[PDB]
Amino acid sequence: SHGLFKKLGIPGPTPLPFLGNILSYHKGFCMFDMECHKKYGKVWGFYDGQQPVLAITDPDMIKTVLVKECYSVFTNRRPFGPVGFMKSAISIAEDEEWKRLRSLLSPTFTSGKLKEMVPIIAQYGDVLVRNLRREAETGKPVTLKDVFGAYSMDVITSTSFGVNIDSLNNPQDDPFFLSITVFPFLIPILEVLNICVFPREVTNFLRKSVKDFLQLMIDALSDLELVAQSIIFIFAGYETTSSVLSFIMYELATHPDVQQKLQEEIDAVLPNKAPPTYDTVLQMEYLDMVVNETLRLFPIAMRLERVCKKDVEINGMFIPKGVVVMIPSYALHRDPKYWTEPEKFLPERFSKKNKDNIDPYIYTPFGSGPRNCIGMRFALMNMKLALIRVLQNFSFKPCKETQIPLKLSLGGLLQPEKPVVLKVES
Amino acid sequence: SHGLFKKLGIPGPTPLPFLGNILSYHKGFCMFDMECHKKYGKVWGFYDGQQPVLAITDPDMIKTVLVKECYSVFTNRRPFGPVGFMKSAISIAEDEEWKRLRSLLSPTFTSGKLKEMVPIIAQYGDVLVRNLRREAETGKPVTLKDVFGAYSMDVITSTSFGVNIDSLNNPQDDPFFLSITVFPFLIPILEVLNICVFPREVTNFLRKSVKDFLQLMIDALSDLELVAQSIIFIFAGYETTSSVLSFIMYELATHPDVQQKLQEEIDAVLPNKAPPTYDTVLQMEYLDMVVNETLRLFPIAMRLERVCKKDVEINGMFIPKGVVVMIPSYALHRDPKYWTEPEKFLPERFSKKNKDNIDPYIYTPFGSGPRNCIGMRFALMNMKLALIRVLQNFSFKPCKETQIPLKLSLGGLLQPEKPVVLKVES
Ligand code: HEM
Numbered sequence A, B: 001s002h003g004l005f006k007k008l009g010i011p012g013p014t015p016l017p018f019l020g021n022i023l024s025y026h027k028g029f030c031m032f033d034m035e036c037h038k039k040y041g042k043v044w045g046f047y048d049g050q051q052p053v054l055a056i057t058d059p060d061m062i063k064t065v066l067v068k069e070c071y072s073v074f075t076n077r078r079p080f081g082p083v084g085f086m087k088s089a090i091s092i093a094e095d096e097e098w099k100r101l102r103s104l105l106s107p108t109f110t111s112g113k114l115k116e117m118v119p120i121i122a123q124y125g126d127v128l129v130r131n132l133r134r135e136a137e138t139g140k141p142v143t144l145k146d147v148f149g150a151y152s153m154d155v156i157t158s159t160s161f162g163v164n165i166d167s168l169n170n171p172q173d174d175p176f177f178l179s180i181t182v183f184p185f186l187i188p189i190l191e192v193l194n195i196c197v198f199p200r201e202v203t204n205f206l207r208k209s210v211k212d213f214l215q216l217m218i219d220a221l222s223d224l225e226l227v228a229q230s231i232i233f234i235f236a237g238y239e240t241t242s243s244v245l246s247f248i249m250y251e252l253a254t255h256p257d258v259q260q261k262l263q264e265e266i267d268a269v270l271p272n273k274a275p276p277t278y279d280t281v282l283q284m285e286y287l288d289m290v291v292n293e294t295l296r297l298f299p300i301a302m303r304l305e306r307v308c309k310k311d312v313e314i315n316g317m318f319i320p321k322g323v324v325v326m327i328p329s330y331a332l333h334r335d336p337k338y339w340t341e342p343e344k345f346l347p348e349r350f351s352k353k354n355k356d357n358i359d360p361y362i363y364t365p366f367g368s369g370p371r372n373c374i375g376m377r378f379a380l381m382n383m384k385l386a387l388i389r390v391l392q393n394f395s396f397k398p399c400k401e402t403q404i405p406l407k408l409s410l411g412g413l414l415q416p417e418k419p420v421v422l423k424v425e426s
């Protein structure tokens, strides 16, 4: 099975038997992606065990895969297991089942239902300053992913349901997945065992805690299929939110000529520390020119993936069935051929002046097509609503223990090695 | 493989393919054991999947298996998995490894180290009355396995380490094992996955909480092998203790002519509510004649098991290798041929007058032989030390919701269906 890329004339790193190419993950997904983009060119192939992965960099191919032929050939993501009752969640569902669930869950992030969420988010952005004013008034670094996490936690529990808890009460919230890929034929076994990658007690904790996004559901849909959708929203709305807030907070304290220039637009549209509304936010381009630049540097999903469900010949290339087409986000976001000095944080790539020479099938940090980030709008609203309410009250400087430059986690997920700490000044 | 008991001329219930006889577990281990003792006689056989189990009732065979030929042919228990680092714990260890660990852990339950534990147990037997005086002074049933559990928890955390917590702070503390037996060939897989029957977070909770019985350890032994031994002691010292306390408490409120007659010996050896010492306890025969009668009725382990590691011919019968010899405790404890009116709770079977006509290879509620209950003494001390400190202060009467007669759990473990509740009067 490992001669599929020798056959189709597609170059690649040679795969070891049984293991495939995962031996080269020893530095991380991202570094293995940038590596081969230099090694073999515009299209290369590798194997995740016996699993052949096609890496595409041509932005038309990318468009064909995510948008044009999404509904036809590349509908679903890579098989990930074992999960259990979670097989119904949207980021996991496939074919016809996903269609019924992406329709049903689209109503949540409209321009009308998101504006309904700015005044309720205006409540926890003040539990964020008051919990960041206690660790500022005293000389002491600050662990951004706790206070932002405590924040991002509070936001998601309400933007969808309605529960309210100051995450200082500490409400709730790659060791073995390594074997998934060399033993994907073992996933069918683990299922008939109820066994979960999500420990069966984080789920039983919520196999009853479920029994607004909650409203707009029961308002056709099932009930064990109702539990799962709350889960994903809770993870993404917490983890992804806090993670990037601290990611930008690092690039603001280590680039203070940008931290002040962003603080000089915040006191222009919102004078006298004016609370942010749905519309004042969308005005601010630098806050966008930054958020889009950090996400151009730290794409929190690194790669997009789709599963080629039949023989196709997109943009000149015969693609066989069962292959995983993989858009290597992190590697493009930092490609020289498309970004000058790409290691450098320069929110002026997303200036209206320059955001013309910017191809949205290279910078896709929320994906694209009918299966793109369904929370992208809610995400880009939830972040800047906290980015404003914090760059009005505090300016951030390096610490003594602040990881400069920031070491990305060479393991799996995209996070820093040591957590981002920063000195906060009022 | 399922023709092993047709071969050896041993009668039994006919086994379905692949499943074996576990279909007959639909009423519980115990009822399936009593059933076949009537069906086929003194020796019968059945299959736990492909796993042949030999049930022996002859008390000499039983003696040959537990005591005489224990070190030789029947050393270890049934293979139970998957476990992980827990493969070193004593109740699990086998062959040579178990010898090094039953020696090392014998010093804990001497007459000298147990007497050192009566004054420290005299401390939580008073947190038991004061937590049972709050639910008595007010008219309200009492859930015995909480207050006893809260008690039995407190005792074991100190009798071995030294930590002290009133278990009212709520400190810490058959869905899928059904597949173990039909798929025992899947246990080798699950191991290379770190996967635990004990959820990997109840263990990570203590993969660091470990880093007296604690003293007598590091005083040769390992450290990941030190964590496991604390675990078993914590379960057995908590669960088994509370469970039987409530088991006797049921048989004392539903047999009050015994509850008073035991309260009439307690105020004889310990006058003026005298605190119990190591020696006053051993004096009291009825408190023993009861504890031994409840355990004759509710044997908390139901069956003893050993694994026949080579061809043998004990007491006339050729026994092949790899068979699990199983002493059906629950079925003997309630055998007519050895106990008149065996359903009836009558602590006078264990009177010194009658405890002569009583064969200790039939009543073995702590087993026997070199692999018997290592905590039996500590157990029979920990229980009566709470049985005294409670039958001095309170008398127990039926409630309106008290399960009379007591329905045993027809699932797996030996517990009641509804928890035992009782009205407590001071
Ligand atoms: C900075 C924050 C976020 C980023 C960078 C991000 C990025 C992404 C990406 C790259 C994808 C995959 C798209 C593809 O492969 O085609 C995705 C999918 C998804 N995201 Fe997010 N996301 C963010 C926040 C959120 C939030 C707050 C939610 C709240 C529910 C969310 C829910 C989802 C869902 C449901 C999907 C899958 C949609 C589907 O498969 O139909 N994301 N996101």
Ligand code: HEM
Pocket: B066, B090, B091, B092, B102, B232, B233, B234, B236, B237, B240, B241, B244, B295, B299, B300, B301, B303, B304, B305, B364, B365, B366, B367, B368, B370, B371, B372, B373, B374, B375, B376, B378, B379
């Ligand atoms: C009423 C209370 C208890 C009862 C009825 C009981 C009963 C038993 C039984 C029937 C066995 C199996 C013997 C065999 O199959 O040969 C056993 C083994 C064992 N019990 Fe208990 N037990 C009790 C309390 C305890 C306590 C408090 C501990 C504390 C550590 C404990 C620790 C153990 C250990 C370590 C073994 C296995 C010894 C070995 O395999 O070497 N038990 N017990």
